[PDB]
C-alpha cells in the first residue's frame, strides 16, 4: 500500500532535523572512461569512489517550487533552471515541503587541491576523537555515517582562490 505526500514531508523533516550531522563529500579525482558524460549513478553505493573528503553542510533546508505573489516575500532560490523557496521545519506540513535543499562550499585548499567528479551528502558523519574542523579527509573521519544522496558530474578543479560550491535539490521518493 502507498506512502502519502505528508509522509514524504515528515521524512524530509526527519532528514532536515539530522542537519548537524550532514556533510558534503567529493571524490572521483581521476577521469571517467568518458569525461564528457559521467556514468549514471548506482543507488547500492555506500561511499564515493576515490574520496577526496568531507565538508560540513552550510545549508540544509526544506524547499518547494515558489508561487507568486504570496511567496514574493519569502527566501527564493534559483537552481537547475527553476525557482524554489525554502521552508522551515515548523511550517513543513502547512507548505507541502517534501523537497530538501543541500549545499556546502569548500574554501580553497581546506581539502587537498585537484579535481573532483563525484558529489554526495552523508548524515551521521563523526570525526576522530577531538577533531573539530569542518573539513575532513577520509583518514580523519571515524564513522562515515550514511551516504544519503550522490551524483556523478563532469570534473571541477580546485585552487586556493576558488570556493567550490556544490548543491542538490532532492525528495525521498522522486518517481511517485
Amino acid at each position: 500500500a502507498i506512502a502519502t505526500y505528508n509522509s514524504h514531508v515528515e521524512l524530509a523533516k526527519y532528514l532536515v532535523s539530522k542537519a548537524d550531522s550532514v556533510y558534503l563529500t567529493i571524490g572521483k579525482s581521476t577521469p571517467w572512461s568518458n569525461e564528457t558524460n559521467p556514468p549514471q549513478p548506482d543507488e547500492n553505493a555506500t561511499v564515493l569512489q576515490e574520496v577526496i573528503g568531507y565538508k560540513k553542510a552550510t545549508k540544509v533546508t526544506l524547499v518547494r517550487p515558489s508561487k507568486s505573489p504570496e511567496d514574493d516575500n519569502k527566501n527564493l532560490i534559483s537552481y537547475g533552471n527553476k525557482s524554489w523557496v525554502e521552508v522551515t521545519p515548523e511550517n513543513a506540513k502547512a507548505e507541502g515541503a517534501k523537497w530538501v535543499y543541500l549545499e556546502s562550499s569548500i574554501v580553497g585548499d581546506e581539502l587537498p587541491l585537484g579535481t573532483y567528479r563525484q558529489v554526495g551528502f552523508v548524515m551521521d558523519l563523526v570525526a576522530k576523537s577531538g577533531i573539530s574542523k569542518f573539513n575532513l579527509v577520509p583518514s580523519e573521519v571515524e564513522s562515515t555515517g550514511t551516504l544519503l544522496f550522490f551524483d556523478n558530474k563532469q570534473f571541477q578543479n580546485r585552487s586556493e582562490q576558488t570556493t567550490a560550491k556544490e548543491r542538490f535539490i532532492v525528495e525521498v521518493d522522486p518517481n511517485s
Binding site: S33, N34, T36, N37, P38, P39, Q40, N152, N175
Partner: protein, 192 residues
C-alpha cells in the same frame, strides 16, 4: 542523466543478415554454428574500461571474419526510463528522438608488431537498404586506439523489438591467424 551501453556478441567467419525483428541468438544457428558467442568475460569486464583485456584469437584470409553484437534498447530503456513508452507501433520514434545523437568509445590494441598492422571496419545494420553499413575504419599496429566514432541519429537502425545489431569486419593483410587485445566498448548520450 547520462547515456551509455552497460551490462550478446558472436565471433565467426560467416556472412549473415538479421530480419527487421530478429531475436538475439538467430545469428549462431543461421551461420551454421560456424562461430562462437563471446566468452562470458566479455559481459563481466569489457563492459567497463579496465586492464582485464578479454583477448581473442582469429582465423582469416580466404574467409573474412567478424564479431557481431547486440544493442537491445528494451534491456535498458525499460530499466533506466520506465516512464517512457517502449511498446507503441512507432515507439522507435521516441527511441531515437529521446536518445538524440549517438557516438562510440571502444579501446583495443594489437599484439602484432610495433611496425606491422591489421584492418578493422565498424558496421551497423540499417533496415532501409538492409545492410551492415560500412560506417568507419581504423588500422592497428601494436599500440592501442579508441577506434570508436561519432555516428549521427539512429532511427534507420531500429529493429522492431526496440533493438539493434552491429558488427566489426576483420581483415589481417596476409596473417592467417592473429590475436587482438580488445579492452572495452560503450555508446554515448544525455538527459535531464
Amino acid at each position: 542523466f547520462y547515456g551509455h551501453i552497460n551490462m550478446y556478441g558472436y565471433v565467426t567467419s560467416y556472412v549473415y543478415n538479421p530480419g527487421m525483428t530478429s531475436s538475439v541468438n538467430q545469428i549462431s544457428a543461421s551461420t551454421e554454428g560456424r562461430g562462437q558467442e563471446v566468452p562470458t568475460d566479455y559481459y563481466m569486464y569489457t563492459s567497463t574500461k579496465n586492464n582485464n583485456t578479454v583477448e581473442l584469437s582469429m582465423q582469416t584470409t580466404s574467409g573474412v571474419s567478424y564479431l557481431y553484437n547486440n544493442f537491445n534498447f528494451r534491456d535498458y530503456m525499460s530499466k533506466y526510463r520506465p516512464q517512457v513508452d517502449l511498446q507503441s507501433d512507432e515507439a522507435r520514434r521516441i527511441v531515437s528522438d529521446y536518445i538524440k545523437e549517438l557516438s562510440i568509445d571502444y579501446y583495443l590494441s594489437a599484439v602484432i608488431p610495433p611496425d606491422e598492422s591489421i584492418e578493422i571496419k565498424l558496421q551497423v545494420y540499417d533496415f532501409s537498404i538492409n545492410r551492415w553499413l560500412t560506417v568507419s575504419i581504423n588500422n592497428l599496429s601494436f599500440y592501442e586506439k579508441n577506434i570508436g566514432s561519432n555516428i549521427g541519429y539512429i532511427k534507420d537502425y531500429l529493429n522492431s523489438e526496440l533493438n539493434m545489431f552491429t558488427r566489426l569486419e576483420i581483415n589481417a593483410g596476409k596473417r592467417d591467424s592473429v590475436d587482438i587485445k580488445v579492452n572495452y566498448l560503450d555508446l554515448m548520450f544525455y538527459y535531464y
